[PDB]
Amino acid sequence: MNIVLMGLPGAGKGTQAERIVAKYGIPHISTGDMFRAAMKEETPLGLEAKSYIDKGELVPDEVTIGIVRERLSKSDCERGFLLDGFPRTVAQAEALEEILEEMGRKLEHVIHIEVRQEELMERLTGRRICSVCGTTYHLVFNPPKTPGICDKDGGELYQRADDNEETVAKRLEVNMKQMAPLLAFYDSKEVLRNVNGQQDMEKVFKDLRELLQGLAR
Ligand SMILES: Nc1ncnc2c1ncn2[C@@H]1O[C@H](COP(=O)(O)OP(=O)(O)OP(=O)(O)OP(=O)(O)OP(=O)(O)OC[C@H]2O[C@@H](n3cnc4c(N)ncnc43)[C@H](O)[C@@H]2O)[C@@H](O)[C@H]1O
Ligand SMILES: [Mg+2]
Ligand SMILES: [Zn+2]
Numbered sequence: 001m002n003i004v005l006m007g008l009p010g011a012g013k014g015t016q017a018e019r020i021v022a023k024y025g026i027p028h029i030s031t032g033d034m035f036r037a038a039m040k041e042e043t044p045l046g047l048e049a050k051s052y053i054d055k056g057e058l059v060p061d062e063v064t065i066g067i068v069r070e071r072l073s074k075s076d077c078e079r080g081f082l083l084d085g086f087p088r089t090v091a092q093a094e095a096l097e098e099i100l101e102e103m104g105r106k107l108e109h110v111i112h113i114e115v116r117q118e119e120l121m122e123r124l125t126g127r128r129i130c131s132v133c134g135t136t137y138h139l140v141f142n143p144p145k146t147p148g149i150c151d152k153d154g155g156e157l158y159q160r161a162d163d164n165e166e167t168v169a170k171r172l173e174v175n176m177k178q179m180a181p182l183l184a185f186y187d188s189k190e191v192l193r194n195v196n197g198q199q200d201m202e203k204v205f206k207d208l209r210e211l212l213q214g215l216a217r
Pocket of ligand 1: 032053054056
């Protein structure tokens with residue numbers, strides 16, 4: 001089970017990934033999550049990626065490909081994997097094709113979780129994160145019991161530098177542009193699947209699942 005989730009910022013890739021991983025036991029490889037972990041640890045990779053992420057820009061291809069090339073060389077990827085938010089450019093996709101060839105593996109599905117931009121903006125604007133456990137909240141759709149405080153451990157919530165409206169509009173524009181040729185790339189390869197992301201989280205998952213169980217032909 002060798003899978004990519006592709007989608008604009010907020011389309012639900014991580015929400016789906018948790019579900020996919022709980023069902024199927026393949027590793028979840030989020031380049032965004034990897035970068036954010038390095039940023040929290042303030043490692044050199046982290047501080048390099050920070051300058052891009054905080055602004056809503058893509059981290060450059062070379063470093064991003066390299067983290068993925070190293071990550072996919074681990075033994076937990078031998079029976080499948082779930083890439084989330086990689087590739088984000090055609091160059092990354094062409095590099096993945098070569099990685100996979102080297103590994104003697106093929107992408108089986110590239111799932112585009114499609115959600116219109118208006119909904120994306122609403123999903124993201126208002127997200128808040130617990131500084132201590134990383135639990136997410138939303139001001140509008142999932143607020144904490146006490147404003148600014150996490151229900152689970154009392155940790156202080158924050159707004160990511162990239163989740164304000166202006167930066168979310170930017171991330172949408174950057175990824176809309178990069179994703180157009182990338183969708184073309186994988187539609188040419190006949191591995192592109194489309195999922196309607198504008199459904200409840202369980203139903204998106206059922207539809208994804210049907211593509212993963214081979215039922216949607
Ligand atoms: N390959 C790469 N090359 C270069 N740079 C890279 C890179 N990969 C990462 N980067 C850098 O790192 C940065 C961050 O990248 P990344 O971490 O990949 O961020 P993203 O994909 O822009 O955005 P999210 O992770 O917020 O969205 P998601 O699709 O995972 O949705 P989620 O499940 O969280 O859900 C979001 C919200 O919606 C809600 N929700 C989910 N599903 C539903 C639904 N079905 N109905 C209603 N609400 C829903 C959720 O509860 C939640 O509140 C990039 O901007 C870039 O700088
Ligand atoms: Mg995500
Ligand atoms: Zn917490």
